[PDB]
Symmetry: D2
Subunit: 394 residues, 4 copies
């Protein structure tokens, strides 16, 4: 009679997503997480002291903000009792944070967990590898941590090259990629104008040197992205290639946070949750085609939760590259009309640590807006991993 | 679902000193041979491993996701996924706990979990290089020195130890007594061969040769009370915490193979130990060293043990003063604690240590023919973590 | 041998502010167009130039030997050799003196000489990168901030100015009076077109456009007594030296064509000026600003002038306080000194300035129809240099 | 009746030459100049207050020791009245310093000048060019100042490549280069053993962290350099090339200083000078074959002083590369038995700022040892310059 508690989600919020060198240029990951943590708890039906753990996914962790989760909890003014830990599973980090929170709740390790992800790519440092013991002679390299994290650590090829591998494998055309890219911006712009993201977005106040900036709207979507402009871009990873800056996701800044608790705890509190978690799955694939990860992850997960793919009402499949998304779409034979319905990574941006949580936030709110139930959120991961999360809106 | 968790292998590298044997080894490189040996001993083939989970404090973007990269570098199949955990000093212990959670829920059947830190090879960082320093001198930041500084209060871990010194009225002399004990017991354990079975030798390919690193290099054979008493305070002007009574900066990895009891029985394996419980407690970061006290008390309640039921404890010595605060607060029996030394004598490769002390505890329980163990450690940022095990 | 030295051209770039118009221009790039224009005006073809000598404070190993590299980059024949001089703030004036020495001895017949500084594009340095920092944080050093710090006493030039303030009992208010004058007279000179002939416009190729930089950008049209009086001391807590009464950090080049009087006559050229003498004096580095006093006195003896014989003087304002010490020590007639502004109003691109003030003095003597000029400046490290000229 | 004073040299001393990362690893240029300045003045027949100027040639100047000459004068304890300035003419910097001193003395600008050169290559810094205004994105370069100074700033080829240009032009063989290289070490070792350098060398005391090291002997010459070892080395600048690390000069540390004064001042003081300067010359050539500089410089200078080449009793022609030396030897048809008779740059090292002064120090002492009169010292210069100095031992 050992019990496994159902996991429900009582709040789901995010910062707007900044562009590289944009509104969040001078914000650290802890600074970017803090206001979102604060608003999540305010909406989530709990006081800070009731939070058992903060778990954050973070790709480019910083030693000056060791343990991003614990540091952000304290910086947010939460009691010293609110512990935290930080997760690195590359692009899926923010989704793994939610899964790890669910595990703690299912087991009764925690009753309430605040979980999500953050990435502040714009403020990420440069590194010197030979400074400690010396370069001795000849020129050295000062390494961009953002550019490093985009390079596979075993094969030393960029994520964009792994995308071109999928282009060749799945015979994906430049037109197909650019159609998806245009769609991503177009649907994002429409959602923004229609106010679809108003509820889920937490404005960030940036204290600059001589003023304060209130950042409240996603800044990656571009009205000037047209079929014409996309077709004129040069290939970014291979000569005679088709993956470009225009049909690839951006480098971006953002945070996203959910409040999760046992269903019994929500009943105790008299709270109507937004959604429940019904399952999650992780699958490993060839790092050289890491973008295909969501296919086996989704298949594995559907088997576990006893859904057909057709049962899903909406899906969020992160667009790391349009080509990568297209490979997943072709492999699973997805109905695009149910997928990324307000855009995805190409139009909205890809703050990597954040994204796995960001797409979950967006999915929850869009299911509710449409009055639909079943959602799948899934994304590829550098290093060759796919992760999928299965939810039901309440 | 709802499985019990057992441990079928528990191994570690020897612990290198800063700039020592492992000077030029990266965290992935240091994890790989220990991952391979653990799986070999743990009764499984690599394809049977569901997840590798590693605790790592100073993660590197050139080895993104240390656990997954190490799994691949170790030659494990692409199906063997991984993720990496940062809970500061307790990272390696949290990795074990996270593995246990997956196994308890039936998320995974077999998990390889532990921790690694390669402090000697950690980089330097420039924070103003991207957008420009503009004018005046800047700082090139040591990632090791950063990770030892509290990120909210901007004081070194050693200063948080001096806070405990003042709070618990701990003498310089008792700190040095504990430091001497740490080296002395470590040296005795090394001499007696207690660590022979748990240590995995590391081969380092140098310019003109290969070196085989097989023995812990931090313990000092000629350390003495007189030497310790002569040292200058390291963190406060009239202070008592010194380089001699503080843990070192060190390099090391440590790995366990965990699986469900069901899976062990199905494979006909006799596990070394089972996990009975685990607990985490948050405290004031300014006295982060006390973390193990509430964590242990919290965990004892959960597993329904009395403190006295424990046969052996490992409480990491981040600083002798910090250990002493815990000893005093819980009124521990020193003769059952850190019986073969701890961080001061053996070193503290931070990401690794939470797993390292668990490895050591498992093997010492077995050596003594004892059952119940507690492993626990403080965590920069104000956290205590505790793991409760029973040797089989 | 034993020739008289005349000057047939004297030109300069406009002076940019730090991070301003010349932000992305290197010293060679900034010297080139001014070298080319000087030679064009100076009555010679490039192949007739025997040597290019440039004063340069923050030399770069990627442009080794600034003078020779600039000569080549300017398209001058391979036969046109060069060398580069560091005598701190007086570097550009020393280049002129060294040119004169070569011409006097018949070592060279025609020399192009001057100075350059591109402070905005100067690099940062790491001193421990080669052999390693090992542990703890390091410094990434601003070469501009380094060059402004005395290398023996490790105090900023601004602090040496505060030493003169105390020594000569100079008020904050008189410093600000001089600072206001410097901007005011510079602005008037700019408005009246006094600098039109001497300035060589610089074209900067930016990402999407070309910019033509033709006017000095340091003078502040809206500077006032009230604004200056409100500023905080920059170098001492109860101090009087401020950012407003100190020279700026700036970018600029300045170049003269010199030759023997014999050579000028042979070429039928009418020179702008002749060099009558020059002098160098060493003083206490802690009050380096006073250098011009002994240098001027020493030189006056050599050329057999009285101070009163001078029609105009240029005494570089490194700091208003430093200028004031010189004015007081020599009992100068302010109405004959820095008549169109100086370093506070116009800027101080250090390698360039010793040549820049000479260019300016030559043209202002001519404009006023006056003969005798003295140009002089202080030098970090405790040196004063003075140049004595007669307009023709 | 304007007078031009004869220039005489009353002292000529040098540090031993350190190897890269060797005995002088942790010594700055000012530190390395100081003891040599001090000993020079002690031998030169003047008190420090009588010194009018210190002039030093220095290739890799440092902003933390601005104006190396003035800084070293003050650090040596010389009075504040002793001014100084620093010269950059690449490899000939140290020789130009002596020439500039001679000019001041000839003109009566100074009566006594201390002049020479210094280079501390081992302690030279690394530079970042994009740190001030930012790298923005992607990896950058941390630049070795030593490696930069060895690269031509117009053509961006290493000095070693300009040497290979001369190899091809003058049809110089690998054997010829290696014979010169072996000779350079062999003659240096012999001179050292015979005590030829005892008088001219000033020992340097290096204060290391836990001891003091007294460095008193040139450390570049190698007894293990053999014809066999040289022939086995790989080409360093061109595939199928012949310039190697073994037949090229090293990277080295050293200082060298002369005391110069008017002949009348020496007579006044009752001093017997070591030597007089009779002339000097500078010639510009193609930077791509900079190594040939000494040929036109020597020819130009001989015309000025009315010497035949045959009149010279000894020559020092710096060996930047054996190949470069060989081109000069072939062009001028030199008698090698009169040239570099105790070795040169390949065996002894090449601390670049120092070398032009170093070879002059060595020449003066060897002329005196052999009881000979006429000397020529000359060297090539990166950027395409040759410089020559003509002296008579007294
Ligand atoms: K919400
Ligand atoms: K084992
Ligand atoms: K976990
Ligand atoms: K002119
Ligand atoms: K000169
Ligand atoms: K001598």
């Amino acid at each position: 009679s050992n019990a496994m508690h159902n996991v429900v989600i009582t709040a789901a919020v995010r910062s707007p997503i900044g562009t590289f060198g944009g509104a969040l240029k001078n914000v650290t990951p802890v600074e970017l997480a803090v206001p979102v943590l604060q608003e999540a708890v305010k909406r989530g039906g709990v006081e800070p002291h009731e939070v058992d753990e903060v778990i954050l996914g973070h790709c480019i962790q910083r030693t000056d903000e060791a343990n991003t989760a614990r540091t952000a909890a304290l910086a947010a003014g939460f009691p010293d009792t609110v512990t935290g830990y930080t997760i690195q599973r590359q692009c899926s980090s923010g989704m793994q944070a939610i899964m790890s929170a669910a595990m703690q709740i299912q087991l009764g390790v925690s009753e309430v967990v605040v979980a999500g992800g953050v990435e502040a790519m714009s403020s990420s440092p440069y590194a010197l590898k030979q400074h400690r013991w010396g370069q001795r002679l000849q020129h050295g390299e000062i390494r961009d941590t953002v550019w490093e994290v985009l390079e596979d650590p075993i094969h030393h090829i960029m994520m964009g090259e792994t995308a071109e591998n999928l282009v060749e494998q799945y015979e994906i055309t430049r037109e197909e990629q650019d159609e998806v890219a245009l769609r991503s911006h177009t649907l994002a712009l429409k959602a923004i104008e229609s106010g679809y993201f108003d509820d889920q977005i937490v404005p960030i106040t940036i204290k600059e040197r001589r003023k304060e900036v209130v950042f409240s709207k996603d800044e990656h979507p571009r009205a000037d992205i047209t079929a014409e402009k996309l077709a004129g871009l040069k290939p970014a990873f291979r000569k005679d290639g088709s993956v470009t800056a225009g049909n690839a996701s951006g480098l971006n800044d953002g945070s996203a946070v959910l409040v999760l608790m046992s269903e019994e705890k929500a009943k105790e509190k008299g709270l109507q949750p937004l959604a429940r978690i019904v399952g999650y799955s992780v699958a490993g694939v060839d790092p050289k085609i890491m973008g295909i990860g969501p296919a086996p992850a989704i298949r594995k997960g559907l088997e576990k939760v006893d859904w057909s793919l057709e049962d899903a009402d909406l899906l969020e499949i992160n667009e790391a590259f349009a080509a990568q998304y297209l490979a997943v779409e072709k492999e699973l034979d997805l109905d695009r009309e149910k997928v990324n319905v307000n855009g995805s990574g190409v139009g909205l941006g890809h703050p990597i640590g954040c994204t796995g949580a960001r797409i979950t936030v967006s999915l929850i709110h869009e299911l509710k807006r449409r009055g639909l139930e079943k959602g799948i959120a899934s994304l590829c991961v550098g290093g060759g991993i796919g992760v999928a999360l299965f939810i039901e809106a309440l």
